[PDB]
Design a protein around this ligand. Structure first.
Ligand code: 402
Ligand code: SF4
Ligand code: SF4
Ligand code: SF4
Ligand code: SF4
Ligand code: FES
Length: 573
């Protein structure tokens, strides 16, 4: 048992950890910036975590182990002068104009400037940001006037995806971050998954705005503007309204969307029940067809890009069912006019997504029919929050309202889509019923839930055993393939999400303070809202969705055939 003194207080512990981790395990205030995902900016360490060790001098707390006899001072003048200097030198390369900034309310660097009363040696007042801004992508943007060069996005890309699509670059003898060869991210192997945004402590990385599309549509008197939110939005957007973590705010969202002027309040969970209808039907067809196996899910656009960029040989094995977003959009321009009288050309369909990659998917040229886009605009969870705040809507106290049912009702199978393994579980609930011509009461598939990187299970379907796998994160897709794990057995159905934890941890989600991430399992607590909804919903199978059944009976017919096969499917070449 080593004995250490921090700020004159004695500690006796048996732990082998850093000074930073021990301090925040014992409520001792140590600042940090570049340390995230268990790694600091190995090159160009920010040194904001500086503490003093007697007999040693100034050290970085985030990567220095505690030792016996250590005497630490976290708040001496020499320490605070050094930290203040590092922040001051960051201010020298930082456009400190918080008023119109999209991180004004939850910025890690503003918090540090205030804490240490840091002050630039010369204010950075760039006069034309076009040199600093890259908005070429359909999903991501870069504003380098805010970039601290802390490396958190580069480390997060490598850790979360193993593509290293975010790189340090040498541009005119100066270090920047960007895509390979400073190209548009879309034109590289980048998945557009936005995990680099999530890792960013400032507004140097953002989603590509679709707020112009939405604003103009709401202002056009002939446009009838539909809005529909992803599963995960209702389990996360309250974090940006001081409501805490894990709060179900579904009903408040419906009310806020009406107060914003949208003409119909639907739900992408209805599209999730559609995807299950088509995809579970396809799985049964492949089973009766003895292949081809495996079938991969096709609903994650980051996974689709990963397949396109790294495993093109797998593209024909992707399910032909459109993603819940695109399958909903297709039906919004065809079935919805048939029950409303709207001119299809005047319908404007907006989705709210926890995801930046969904903007690329919606803008794919072939994602349209008769000149009408499936989906006209995609705003992130963060974008909707700003929308509500700009309209001065008191979100935290809104009364609950319901969705418009026609394309708004959803089963519990659709509700869990946002968590890793949720698509797999939802698909199995319908597929087993379909294949066995039965109504089975045992529907919970806990074996595919959870935060394990690769999850596998053996399922019995119509007196035969099948192998399924759930791949939780793009880096785990690489591991699954490169290790030969896809060859330990014959796999028949495989779910892939590019974001660890599923869509609840998507690239369009609210940022979380690094000190909140050490105390809150954000993947688990956001997902728990969705699993709770499934528990309490009166329908827990996608093919039991009353409004969906009515849509197929009156308009699309039976899944996988005819009209459904005609327009609700999409294949990648
Ligand atoms: N389309 C679609 Fe999906 C559905 O429903 C979302 O909206 Fe997802 C979420 N939340 C996102 O982004 S995509 C991948 N499959 C799981 S969930
Ligand atoms: S990134 Fe932060 S410190 Fe910089 S202008 Fe925006 S809110 Fe202010
Ligand atoms: S873009 Fe953000 S995460 Fe990346 S180096 Fe700049 S400040 Fe750090
Ligand atoms: S969007 Fe995803 S794949 Fe692309 S650079 Fe960012 S983290 Fe990497
Ligand atoms: S897991 Fe979800 S949030 Fe992440 S890239 Fe895929 S669809 Fe988007
Ligand atoms: S947080 Fe320790 S060197 Fe950056």
């Amino acid at each position: 048992m080593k004995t250490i003194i921090i700020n004159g207080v004695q500690f006796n512990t048996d732990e082998d950890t850093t000074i930073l981790k021990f301090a925040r395990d014992n409520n001792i205030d140590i600042s940090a910036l570049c340390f995230l995902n268990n790694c600091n900016n190995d090159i160009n360490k920010c040194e904001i975590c500086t503490v003093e060790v007697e007999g040693t001098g100034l050290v970085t707390a985030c990567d220095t182990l505690i030792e016996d006899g250590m005497i630490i001072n976290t708040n001496s003048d020499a320490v605070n002068e050094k930290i203040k200097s590092r922040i001051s030198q960051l201010l020298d390369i930082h456009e400190f104009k918080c008023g119109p900034c999209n991180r004004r309310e939850n910025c890690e660097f503003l918090k540090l400037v205030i804490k240490y009363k840091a002050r630039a040696s010369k204010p950075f007042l760039p006069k034309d940001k076009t040199e600093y801004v890259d908005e070429r992508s359909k999903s991501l943007t870069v504003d380098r006037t805010k970039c601290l060069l802390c490396g958190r996005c580069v480390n997060a890309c490598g850790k979360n995806t193993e593509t290293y699509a975010m790189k340090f670059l040498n541009k005119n003898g100066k270090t920047i971050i960007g895509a390979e060869d400073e190209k548009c991210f879309d034109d590289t192997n980048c998945l557009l998954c936005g995990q680099c945004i999530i890792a960013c402590p400032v507004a140097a990385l953002s989603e590509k705005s679709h707020m112009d599309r939405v604003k103009n549509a709401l202002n056009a008197p002939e446009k009838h503007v539909i809005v529909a939110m992803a599963p995960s939005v209702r389990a996360s957007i309250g974090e940006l309204f001081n409501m805490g973590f894990g709060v179900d705010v579904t009903g408040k969202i419906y009310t806020a969307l009406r107060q914003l002027g949208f003409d119909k309040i639907f739900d992408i969970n209805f599209g999730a029940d559609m995807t299950i209808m088509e995809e579970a039907t396809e799985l049964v067809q492949r089973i009766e067809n003895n292949g081809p196996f495996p079938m991969f899910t096709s609903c994650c656009p980051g996974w689709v890009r990963q397949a396109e960029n790294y495993y093109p040989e797998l593209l024909n094995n992707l399910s032909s069912a459109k993603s819940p977003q695109q399958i909903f959009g297709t039906a919004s321009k065809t079935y919805y006019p048939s029950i409303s009288g709207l001119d299809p050309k005047n319908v404007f369909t907006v989705t709210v997504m926890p995801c930046t990659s969904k903007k690329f998917e919606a803008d794919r040229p072939q994602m349209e029919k008769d000149g009408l886009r499936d989906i006209d605009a995609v705003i992130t969870t963060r974008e909707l929050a700003k929308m509500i705040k700009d309209a001065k809507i008191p979100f935290a106290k809104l009364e609950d309202s319901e969705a418009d049912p026609a394309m708004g009702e959803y089963s519990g199978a659709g509700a869990i889509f946002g968590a890793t393994g949720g698509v797999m579980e939802a698909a199995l609930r319908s597929a087993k019923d379909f294949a066995e011509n039965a109504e089975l009461e045992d529907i919970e598939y806990k074996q595919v839930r959870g935060l394990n990187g690769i999850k596998e299970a053996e399922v019995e379907i119509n007196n035969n055993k099948y192998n399924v796998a759930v791949i939780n994160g793009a880096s785990n897709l690489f591991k699954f393939m490169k290790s030969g794990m896809i060859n330990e057995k014959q796999y028949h159905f495989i779910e892939v999400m590019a974001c660890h934890g599923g869509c609840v941890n998507g690239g369009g989600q609210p940022h979380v303070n690094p000190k909140d991430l050490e105390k809150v399992d954000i993947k688990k607590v956001r997902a728990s809202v969705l699993y709770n909804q499934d528990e309490h919903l009166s329908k827990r199978k996608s093919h039991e969705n009353t409004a969906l059944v009515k849509m197929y009976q009156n308009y699309f017919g039976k899944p996988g055939e005819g009209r459904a096969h005609e327009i609700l499917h999409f294949k990648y070449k």
